[model samples]
Target: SNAMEQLTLQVEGMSCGHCVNAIESSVKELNGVEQVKVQLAEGTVEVTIDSSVVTLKDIVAVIEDQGYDVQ
Candidate 1:
């Protein structure tokens, strides 16, 4: 069985498609991430990851590394 974990982050500083792409790509590159959906208009990033392999802090760090704040 697959154990999925989800995180909904209120992201700020997204200005265009590139910003969305960057954030999406960053999260997708994580080892445990199964999928990522970022909504620029709503300033929300939803990530689904394998709970067994990744932690919330790991996911949060990816977003923070890009100079964006996640709440």
Candidate 2:
């Protein structure tokens, strides 16, 4: 089985429900991404990824694609 990893990213510019939904929705659709949770209040995102298929850089790119800054 592939190794699963948990990552917490400090994302910026997430202030509304739409922001949260945008990040979560986008990240969830990627292959090898098991789960995604965006915390608008804290401006952070928690992602569970299968490292065998996806890399941390990919995850960050996806989040940035949604118009957010991943710190």
Candidate 3:
């Protein structure tokens, strides 16, 4: 079976729908990412990934690339 894993990131600077779309699209484009969900109200990003193929840091970098702050 694949190494499916769950990752939650605390993201800031996301106040509009564009921010959510940007993050969702960018993260989804990566390999091994099965799902990307952004909760604007709670400022949290929930992601499902295959750890065997993609690292948590890889996803973090992708989110940051969209100009958002991740903690």
Candidate 4:
């Protein structure tokens, strides 16, 4: 069994709600993601995920697909 963990991503190029929505939706669509919260003003995305079924690479790819980079 795996544990739940949180990843705090410093996202770049988020200018409005749409960017946040895109990131949030993408993360939520991932199989092991438990919760995703993006703070546009702070330029951060906090994700709670189940490590048993997902990897950091998968999360990064999802964020990149949303037209943003995660630092």
Cα lDDT, all candidates: 0.87, 0.86, 0.87, 0.87
Model 1, position 56: C-alpha lDDT score: 82
Q: Give the lDDT of residue 42 in candidate 4.
A: 95
Q: What is the lDDT of candidate 2?
A: 0.86
Q: Write the per-residue lDDT of candidate 3 for residues 1-65, one digit (tens) a residue.
A: 18988888899889898888889877888998989878988999899999998888888898898
Model 2: how far residue 50 lies from native, Å: 0.4
lDDT score of residue 48 within candidate 3: 90
Clashing pairs in 4: none
lDDT of 1 by residue, 1-71 (tens): 16787778899889888999899988888888899989999999999988788778888887899978998
Ranking by TM-score: 3, 4, 2, 1
TM-score of each prediction: 0.90, 0.91, 0.92, 0.91
The 10-residue segment with the lowest total lDDT in model 4: 1-10
Span of ten consecutive residues with least summed lDDT in model 2 = 1-10
- Candidate 4 C-alpha error for residue 62, in Å: 1.4
Q: What's model 3's lDDT at 60? A: 88
On residues 1-71, what C-alpha lDDT tens digit does candidate 2 reach at each position?
18889899999878788888888977887898998878889888898999999888888898898888897
